Each structure stands twice: as structure tokens, then as C-alpha cells.
Amino acid sequence: DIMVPSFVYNKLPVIHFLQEKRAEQKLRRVLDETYTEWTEELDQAHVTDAITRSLNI
Amino acid sequence: YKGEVPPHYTRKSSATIEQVEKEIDALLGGAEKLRKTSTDDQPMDKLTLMERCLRHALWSYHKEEGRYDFDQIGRWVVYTPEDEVKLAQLKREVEAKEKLAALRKR
Amino acid sequence: VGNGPTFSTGGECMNTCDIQNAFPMNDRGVRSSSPFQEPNTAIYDSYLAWTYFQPMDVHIEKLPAPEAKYYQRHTKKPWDVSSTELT
Amino acid sequence: TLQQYRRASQDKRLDDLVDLLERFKPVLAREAIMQRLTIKHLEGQLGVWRYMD
Amino acid sequence: MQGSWSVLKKNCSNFFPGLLAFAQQTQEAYGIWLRIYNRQQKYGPTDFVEQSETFSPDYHKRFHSQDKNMWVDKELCTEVSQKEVARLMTYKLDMWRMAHCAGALLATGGYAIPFGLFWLANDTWVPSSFNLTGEELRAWREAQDLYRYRSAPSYLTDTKWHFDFHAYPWNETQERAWDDLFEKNDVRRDPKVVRPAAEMYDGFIKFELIRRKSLRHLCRSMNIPTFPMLARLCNGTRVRDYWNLAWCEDYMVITQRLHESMTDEELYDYAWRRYLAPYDKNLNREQLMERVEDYFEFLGPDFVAHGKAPNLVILTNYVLGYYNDPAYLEGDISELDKNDYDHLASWGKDAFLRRLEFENGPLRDQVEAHTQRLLAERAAIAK
Lengths: 57, 106, 87, 53, 383
Ligand SMILES: CCCCCCCCCCCCCCCCCC(=O)OC[C@H](COP(=O)([O-])OCC(O)COP(=O)([O-])OC[C@@H](COC(=O)CCCCCCCCCCCCCCCCC)OC(=O)CCCCCCCCCCCCCCCCC)OC(=O)CCCCCCCCCCCCCCCCC
Ligand SMILES: CCCCCCCCCCCCCCCCCC(=O)OC[C@H](COP(=O)([O-])OCC(O)COP(=O)([O-])OC[C@@H](COC(=O)CCCCCCCCCCCCCCCCC)OC(=O)CCCCCCCCCCCCCCCCC)OC(=O)CCCCCCCCCCCCCCCCC
Ligand SMILES: CCCCCCCCCCCCCCCCCC(=O)OC[C@H](COP(=O)([O-])OCC(O)COP(=O)([O-])OC[C@@H](COC(=O)CCCCCCCCCCCCCCCCC)OC(=O)CCCCCCCCCCCCCCCCC)OC(=O)CCCCCCCCCCCCCCCCC
Ligand SMILES: CCCCCCCCCCCCCCCCCC(=O)OC[C@H](COP(=O)([O-])OCC(O)COP(=O)([O-])OC[C@@H](COC(=O)CCCCCCCCCCCCCCCCC)OC(=O)CCCCCCCCCCCCCCCCC)OC(=O)CCCCCCCCCCCCCCCCC
Ligand SMILES: CCCCCCCCCCCCCCCCCC(=O)OC[C@H](COP(=O)([O-])OCC(O)COP(=O)([O-])OC[C@@H](COC(=O)CCCCCCCCCCCCCCCCC)OC(=O)CCCCCCCCCCCCCCCCC)OC(=O)CCCCCCCCCCCCCCCCC
Ligand SMILES: CCCCCCCCCCCCO[C@@H]1O[C@H](CO)[C@@H](O[C@H]2O[C@H](CO)[C@@H](O)[C@H](O)[C@H]2O)[C@H](O)[C@H]1O
Known about the structure:
The structure is cut from a larger assembly and holds 1 copy of chain A, 2 copies of chain B, 1 copy of chain C and 1 copy of chain E.
Chain A: H1 3-32, H2 44-54
Chain B: H1 17-29, H2 46-65, H3 70-76, H4 81-105
Helix pairs in contact in B: 1-2
Chain E: H1 5-13, H2 15-43, H3 46-50, H4 82-108, H5 113-120, H6 134-166, H7 172-181, H8 191-194, H9 196-204, H10 212-221, H11 232-256, H12 258-261, H13 264-273, H14 285-299, H15 301-306, H16 312-320, H17 351-360, H18 364-382
Helix pairs in contact in E: 1-5, 2-4, 4-11, 6-10, 10-11, 13-14
PDB class: membrane protein
Keywords: ATP synthase, mitochondria, membrane protein
Entry title: rotational state 1c of the Trypanosoma brucei mitochondrial ATP synthase dimer
């Protein structure tokens, strides 16, 4: 009725702070893993060159 | 050049891109009053981080699909000088193809 | 404003306690008496220094109510008794 | 042909975006809850039992 | 789970059939254990057979050592099948509880009868053989899962709090592993990220140095009876034997890929015996397979290569993390619009409260300025 309640009440602030920091860390890790992937596609000049060769030019 | 068509993938959930964009807009609209701007070098907020991640993914998907809206892509996807160079290279290519098609038609 | 109490301090000064970092600091440089943010926190100097927070009427931009799905967790167990019920 | 090639990756990206949205929503819910708790705390009408619950 | 009259009737009706089934299972499990023990004594390493002594560095108290006193029989499949091992493990649990009850009966003569009535009113400590139908078995499994939920969080908190209060990780990867190890079951933990915690805790505490209170909590979470607990080297031996059998079966399955061919119910039971899959979660085959693969990955390649599992304390914490449900939160957010100290409104504010409100209220700056100016004037006049 007296002791354990008081010590729990004393614990609350530090635990709240640490859990907030942990959530911020999770969000930071989520953001840090985001990279924009620039894809590379076959240049159409080679396609045009192959078209010309097929014409026997 | 590509090689083989990549192995088929089954979606875990069903949802359209338009629906996802609408949901994102709804989520970010309720926090507009709470959202506060700050200097670029200053630390970011939770709302700003969520907005950046969501918009980055959305616009990456759009650019892969074909909806080349450079105005928003340059904002929600550019974070590296290499990214800026790639965007500029892409921007020239799309405009060049559009001009070429128009004059080839004319 | 009401006369109600606030988060208990134990008669301690949070600017010098061993867990002071857990208490946010306001613009004036006075650490809060609680994990919450307090703008008008003060320190009084009796034989020992102690922190105080005076409740006041302040408006805060209230984020709209979320859905019950995203904050309710129905993991309750027969042995579980809530803090309100215990009180 | 290109669309067929860039299909599985697009579906995975869409699913990941949906999961990210569902992951972010609880954070906003917690933020709103903390806002309300702080509002009641500033009014001196917040009990520690309510805060813990 | 709390006792009830319906469960009492169920257990009373099935008491004698349950005893007969338990005796038959006892004969079968004695045969299986005879085979296993003969194989261990014949092909076991010298240290394992001779029971090498490992003493603590502080009080020189002997306890089982994971490396020496635990041995994985890679070639046990020739003599004993996986199903036989699972049967032996289940019978070991049931026999432990039955032995404790029988010891109580022998000790207290005929005065244990009302305590027996209490015992039969709850499925927590009755053998699985007392259930003769699917619904009864489901209720029994629910009771066991409830006990696991009741017990595991205390063990996890004990471990985490002790380590964090008395030590910190060395490097960032260890920090990430430690933080992600004790996440709630609602999120999926990556075994590769979490594995380094095993070595870190080996640096902190091994299975040979496990404290008696932590052991009691673990045994509670494993549905192992704890009264009379006695010295820590009895339930410790029980835990070692159970996990050695589990590791042998796991090696057999990994080598032979039995889990892929394993049926849904058998797969669920296999995960349950590893404390990975509660029955109340209604998991499907996909989730069970994911959890089992994560468990195998956590064991690591070294388990197959040499039969060496990671630190048993960390393994137990990792597996029991699936019973660490998120903290319950019930009630609409609108409840936050109420007030808690309305009953004090009639009392109002006294002189001291009015003074505090005046000094620290919105007029605080004006009061501070006036007070400081007055004090400065008085000091100047004094000088
Ligand atoms: C009539 C006189 C009465 C005297 C007073 C008694 C008062 C009560 C005290 C308790 C007495 C025992 C109660 C019955 C227990 C059941 C039998 C048993 O041991 O079960 C195995 C099991 C062994 O546990 P374990 O942790 O697995 O053992 C680890 C070993 O490494 C295991 O080794 P392993 O890994 O190699 O595996 C071996 C395993 C492999 O086998 C198997 O796997 C097959 C299964 C075998 C076991 C089956 C057990 C079945 C239990 C249920 C029985 C049915 C109950 C029905 C109830 C309802 C009835 C209507 O086989 C065994 O379990 C063998 C264990 C060794 C034998 C122990 C028995 C020794 C005493 C009997 C001989 C006495 C001779 C007297 C000669 C006199 C000369 C003058 O027993 C227990 O669960 C332990 C007992 C738990 C209660 C402890 C309570 C405190 C005890 C303090 C005693 C102090 C000394 C006495 C004075 C007290 C003063 C205060
Ligand atoms: C036919 C059947 C088949 C054959 C038989 C088979 C064998 C059967 C036997 C074996 C069975 C084993 C399994 C048993 C499981 C159930 C155990 C149990 O009791 O569970 C709690 C059980 C309920 O269990 P549950 O609801 O299922 O919940 C279980 C949960 O999992 C909760 O689980 P938990 O783990 O949280 O609960 C554990 C809890 C268990 O404890 C409890 O829960 C406490 C139970 C009692 C609570 C009483 C509260 C009410 C008090 C009322 C006071 C009087 C009121 C006014 C009356 C006015 C009347 C006119 O705590 C403990 O375990 C503590 C252990 C303490 C050990 C003590 C050792 C002392 C050693 C001494 C030192 C020695 C040192 C060495 C010295 C050496 C020197 C050389 O409690 C009850 O049912 C309460 C019964 C209350 C009866 C009425 C009050 C007492 C009446 C006394 C009448 C006296 C008449 C004569 C008077 C003469 C005057 C001259
Ligand atoms: C606000 C006021 C309210 C009222 C308050 C009332 C006043 C209280 C004031 C004082 C209170 C504190 C007293 C402390 C004393 C010192 C204790 C101490 O040093 O303990 C060290 C140490 C601590 O125990 P532990 O094993 O480390 O863990 C204890 C935890 O509680 C284990 O917890 P856990 O969570 O790890 O495990 C939970 C679960 C785990 O589940 C299991 O383990 C499965 C189920 C196991 C069933 C039991 C198996 C027993 C096996 C045999 C044990 C050895 C027997 C030795 C030979 C027999 C000696 C008599 O175990 C249970 O549920 C146990 C159920 C036991 C129910 C009985 C509790 C007592 C209720 C009263 C009944 C008797 C009333 C007599 C007086 C009235 C007569 C008219 O004790 C032991 O080593 C245990 C030795 C037990 C020996 C037998 C009992 C000897 C005492 C005399 C018995 C007389 C019987 C009379 C029958 C009727 C005659 C007419
Ligand atoms: C209602 C019933 C009432 C009953 C009352 C009787 C007492 C209670 C009965 C039993 C209660 C149940 C629980 C008992 C404790 C269980 C402990 C435990 O968990 O052990 C696990 C443990 C199993 O674990 P483990 O891994 O297999 O082996 C342990 C490891 O080695 C561990 O490795 P470690 O690294 O820890 O190695 C160290 C370990 C090594 O020790 C061991 O563990 C080995 C086993 C013990 C060996 C003990 C004998 C040593 C040699 C004695 C030589 C004496 C020569 C004298 C010559 C005289 C010539 C004139 O421990 C020691 O070094 C301790 C040595 C003993 C020191 C004794 C100091 C006494 C000082 C006396 C001061 C003065 C007294 C007053 C004045 C008297 C004179 C006027 O069990 C044992 O090893 C043996 C357990 C034996 C249990 C006690 C059996 C009781 C039998 C009672 C029969 C009589 C009944 C009378 C009834 C009367 C009417 C009611
Ligand atoms: C309602 C009330 C009614 C009246 C009640 C009257 C009460 C009388 C008050 C006086 C009693 C004082 C004794 C209290 C015992 C409880 C202490 C305790 O729980 O401490 C917790 C203590 C704290 O542990 P922790 O802090 O969690 O962890 C620290 C370590 O990590 C732990 O790690 P660890 O477990 O590895 O290390 C410990 C272990 C390490 O060592 C081992 O593992 C090796 C084991 C070696 C065993 C050697 C046995 C030698 C026996 C020789 C017999 C030869 C045969 C003789 C035959 C002819 C003569 C009969 O060594 C031991 O603990 C065993 C030491 C030797 C035990 C001897 C048997 C018990 C004697 C009790 C009576 C003492 C005199 C009383 C009168 C004077 C009082 C001032 O834990 C233990 O000690 C655990 C073991 C507890 C075993 C003793 C209790 C067994 C159950 C008793 C059954 C009989 C019940 C009779 C009921 C009577 C009712 C009237
Ligand atoms: C009241 C007491 C209750 C006791 C309950 C438990 C009883 C258990 C009995 C087990 C009997 C096992 O039987 C025993 O096994 C061992 C190990 O295979 C055999 O051991 C044999 O092979 C081993 C291994 O190569 C050799 O080290 C040993 O020299 C040789 O004898 C014994 O020859 C056999 O007799």
C-alpha cells in the first residue's frame, strides 16, 4: 500500500523518457534506411543502331 | 538486356495507388496545425519525417510507373547530388522525347 | 484554474536530481516536475530547494481523435487490475 | 513489356508503403494521447492512475 | 487460470482413464529414455558422461555447463525418431507435475484430499492425459498458455533490468540486439540482429551462473512445478534435460527438413513445445513456419556444424518474448476529456495556494520584477 507504489511512482519518469527515446530511435532507423533507387534502362541509340543494321545499310 | 522477367510476387494486401495516396493525404492533413516548419539544418519533427518517408516512397513508385511529375519528384526524392544529377538527366530525356515525337508527327 | 494536485515530486529539485535528464527543460531553464512539458515551472528555496508547477489555463492544438484500432490493445487477463480500479 | 518487367518490385513497394502507413498511424495516436494527457496535467485534473492506464 | 466447477467435473470424470493413459505413456517413455540414455552413455563425450564439474568464480557452487554438460546427439535419428522425442518431452512435463502431486500425497497422508479438489478444479497442473476430447485439450492448452503469459514477463524483466542496471553493451550492434531482443510479440524480431546478445550475455552471465530467482521464473514460464523448489540444481537439471532433448529434435528436423513435411497440428505442437506459438493466437501455417525458421536461424549455423547452441538464458528470453503481449489499453479516448480532482473543487484555495497561483501564474513576470526591485531598493537603503 505504501512502499512499492512510491517506488513505482519514482520509476515512472525515467522509463517514460527512455521509451520516448527508443521510439525516436526506431523512427530514425526507419528514415535512415530509405534510399532512392535510380534504375538504368537500355539506351535507345543501340536499338536504333540495330534497326539500321537489320536494314542492311 | 533486362534478362529474365523477375519471379512473380503475390501481394499480401490489396490496395490501389490512388487509395494509398488519399490515405496519406488524410493522415497528413489532420496534423497540419501541429506541424511546424523549421530550418533545413535544424532537427526534424515526427510529422516531417513521416511526410518525407511517405512522399518519397509514393513518388518513387510513381516515377517507376511512368507518372513523371518532376515538380514533386525534385522535392520528395532529391537528397543527394547524385540524385540531382540523375533527375536532371531524366528531365532532359523526357522533354527531348516529347519534342522529337511532336516534330516527327508534324 | 482548479486546485487539483499534479504529478508528485517528493519534495525534490529536478535541476539537481540524479535523474534530472528525464525532466524536460523549458525556455527559462527550469526542468519540469513531470515528464510532461511545463512552461511556468519554478523553484522555491526553503532549507532545501524544491520544484513547483502551477496549473494554468493554456490552449494546446489538439490532434484529432484517432481510431480505436490503433491505440486499443485487448490483451487484458483475468488477473489484470487497472490502476483506476486499484485506486 | 517494361511494365511486366517492373511488376513484382512495384507490388512489393506498394505493400511496404501500406505497412509503413499502418506503422506510423499508432505513433500519431500515441502523440494525440500524450497531448490530451498534457492538457489535463496543465489543468491539474490528471491522476497518476489515469496516466499509467 | 482460476479454478472452476466445470473443470473440476471434467477432471473427476476422466481421473482413472487419465491415470491409465499416464501409466501407458510412462512405459513408452521409459523405453524411449532407456534407448536415449544408453546412446548417451555409449557415444557421449567423456565430460558429458563423467558429469564434469563447473564451479562459479565467486562462491564455487556447481551448476550445469552448457558446453560440457549438454551434448547434441547428431546420430540419434537412427535409434529414436522425432515423434518419440516429443512424446518423451510431453511425458516429462506430465511426470514432473504428477510426481510433485504424489509427493504431496505421500507427505500429508489423507489430508491432501481438499488440496486435490483444488488441483482438479484447474487445468494448470493436471496432466495432458486427463483430456479425452478436443475441446478439453484446447482448454488445457489455454490454461498452460495463460500460465506462460503470467510468468514470462517477470523473467524477461528480471534479466533486462539486472543487465541494464549492472552493465552496458560494448558496441552499437550489441546495443541494437539487446534493445530488439525484448520487444513485444506484436512486432517481428530479426534473429540475425538479435544473435550477438547471446555472446554479450555470455560475457555477463552464462547458464552456469543463473540465479535461483531467475530460475524460478523460468521454470514457471516453462510450466515446470516449482514447489518445493529446493536447490537451484534440481529444476536446473530439469531445464537442461528438456532443452537438450529439444536441441536434439531440432537438429534432427533441421538436417532432415521434417518441419516442411510436418502437418499443421504437429507443427503447432512443435512450435508450442519451443514456447514460440501460443494457441490463443490462432496462427496459420505461414506464421508457424516463419517463427520456426527464425528459431533455427537464431540457433545459427554453428548449431548444425558442432551442436553448440547460443546462450540458453538468451534463447529462453527470445522464445518467451512471444508471450510478452503488448500492455493492455481499453477505453475510448473520449474518457480523457473528464477530470480526476472534481471532488476537491469544494475546498477551494487557501492563502498559500492563492499566493502560489499569483506568483507563478500569468502575472509571474510582473510579480518577480516588482519583488526584485523592492528587494534591491531595500538593500540599497540598508547600505
Ligand atoms: C513409503 C515411504 C515414504 C517416505 C516419505 C516420502 C514423503 C514424500 C517425499 C517425496 C517422495 C517421492 C514422491 C514420488 C515421486 C515420483 C517418483 C520420482 O522420483 O519421479 C521422477 C521425478 C524425477 O525428477 P527429475 O527432476 O526429472 O529428476 C532428475 C534426474 O536427473 C532424473 O534422472 P534421469 O534424467 O536419468 O531420468 C531418470 C528417469 C527416467 O525414467 C523415465 O523417464 C520414466 C518415468 C520414471 C518416473 C515415473 C514417475 C511417476 C510419478 C507419478 C506416479 C503416479 C502418481 C499417482 C497419483 C494418484 C494416485 C491415486 O527415471 C526417474 O525418474 C528415476 C528417478 C530416480 C528414482 C527416485 C526414487 C527414489 C525413491 C524410491 C526408492 C525407495 C527405496 C527405499 C528403500 C528402503 C531401505 C531401508 O521425480 C520428481 O518429480 C521429483 C520429486 C518432486 C517432489 C519433491 C518433494 C520434496 C522431496 C524431498 C525428499 C527428501 C528425502 C525424504 C525425506 C523427507 C523429509 C521431509
Ligand atoms: C481426490 C483427488 C485426487 C487424489 C489426491 C491427489 C493429490 C492432491 C494434492 C496435491 C495437489 C497439488 C496442487 C494444488 C493446487 C492448488 C493449491 C491452492 O491451494 O491454490 C490456491 C487455492 C485457489 O487456487 P485457484 O483459485 O485455482 O488459483 C490458482 C492460481 O494459479 C494461483 O496460483 P499461485 O501460484 O499464485 O498460488 C500459490 C499460493 C498458494 O497459496 C494460496 O493461494 C493461499 C491459500 C489460502 C488462502 C486463505 C484465504 C482465506 C483465509 C480465511 C481465514 C478464516 C476466515 C474466517 C473463518 C471462520 C469460520 C467459522 O502461494 C503459495 O504457493 C504459497 C506456498 C506456501 C508454502 C508454505 C510452506 C511452509 C513451510 C514452513 C517452514 C518450514 C521450514 C523448515 C523447518 C525445519 C525444522 C527442522 O486456494 C483456495 O482454494 C482457497 C481455499 C480456502 C479455504 C477456506 C479457508 C481455510 C479453511 C481452514 C479450515 C481449517 C479446519 C480445521 C481447524 C482446526 C482448529 C483447531
Ligand atoms: C493478513 C493475514 C492473512 C492470514 C495469514 C496467515 C498467517 C501466516 C503467518 C506466517 C506466514 C509465513 C510463514 C513462512 C514460514 C517459513 C517458510 C519457509 O522457510 O519456506 C522455505 C521454503 C520456501 O519454499 P519454496 O519451495 O522455495 O517456494 C515457495 C513458494 O511459495 C512457491 O511458489 P511458486 O510460485 O514457485 O510455486 C507455486 C506453485 C507451484 O506449483 C507446484 O509446485 C505444483 C503443486 C505442488 C503441490 C505440493 C507439493 C509438495 C511435495 C512435498 C513437499 C515436501 C513435504 C515434506 C514432508 C511433509 C512435512 C509436513 O505452488 C503452489 O501452488 C503451492 C501450493 C501449496 C498450498 C498450501 C499452502 C499453505 C496453506 C495452508 C494449508 C496448511 C494449513 C495447516 C494449519 C492448519 C491445520 C488445521 O519452503 C520449502 O522449501 C517448502 C517445504 C515444504 C514442506 C512441507 C510443508 C511443511 C510445513 C508444515 C506442513 C503442515 C501440514 C498440516 C496439514 C494439516 C494438519 C491437520
Ligand atoms: C519431518 C521430516 C523432518 C526432516 C528433518 C531432516 C532434514 C530435512 C530433510 C530433507 C528435506 C528436503 C530438502 C533437503 C535439502 C535439499 C538440498 C538439495 O537441493 O540438494 C540437491 C542435491 C542434488 O544435486 P546434485 O547436483 O546431484 O549434487 C549436489 C552438488 O554436489 C552440489 O555441488 P556444490 O558445488 O554445491 O558442492 C557442495 C555440496 C557438497 O555436498 C553435497 O551436495 C553432497 C551431499 C551431502 C553430503 C553430506 C555428508 C557429508 C559428510 C558427513 C560426514 C560426517 C562424519 C561424522 C562422524 C561422527 C563420528 C562420531 O555442499 C556442501 O559442501 C555441503 C556439505 C554439508 C555440510 C554440513 C554442515 C553441517 C554443520 C553442522 C553444525 C552443527 C550442528 C549441530 C550440532 C551437532 C553435533 C552435536 O542433493 C544432494 O546432493 C543430496 C540431497 C540430500 C537431501 C537430504 C536428505 C534427507 C534425509 C533425512 C533422513 C533423516 C530423517 C529424520 C526424520 C526425523 C523425524 C521427523
Ligand atoms: C507455522 C510454523 C510451524 C513451526 C515451524 C518451525 C520453523 C523452524 C525455524 C528454523 C528453520 C531454519 C531453516 C529454514 C529453511 C529454509 C531456508 C530457505 O528457504 O532459504 C532460502 C535460500 C535462499 O536462496 P536464494 O537467496 O534464492 O539463492 C542463494 C543461492 O543461490 C542458493 O543456491 P543453492 O540452492 O545452490 O545453495 C543452497 C544449497 C547448496 O548446497 C547444495 O546444493 C548441496 C546440498 C547439501 C545437502 C546436505 C544435507 C545433509 C543432511 C545430512 C543427513 C544425514 C542423515 C542423518 C539421519 C539420522 C538423523 C536424523 O544448500 C542448501 O541450501 C542446503 C543446506 C543444507 C540443508 C539441510 C536440510 C534442512 C535443515 C533445516 C533445519 C535447520 C535447523 C533448524 C533449527 C534451528 C533454527 C535456528 O535458499 C535455499 O537455501 C534453497 C534450499 C532450501 C532447502 C531447505 C528447505 C527444504 C524444505 C524443508 C522440508 C521440511 C519441512 C519441515 C516443516 C516443519 C514444520 C514445523
Ligand atoms: C529405487 C531406484 C530406482 C531407479 C530408477 C532408475 C533405474 C535406471 C536403470 C538404468 C539401467 C541402464 O543399464 C545400464 O546401462 C549402461 C549404459 O548403457 C550399461 O553400461 C555399459 O555400457 C557403458 C557404455 O559403453 C559402459 O561404460 C559400462 O561399463 C557398461 O556396463 C550397463 O551395462 C547397463 O546395466
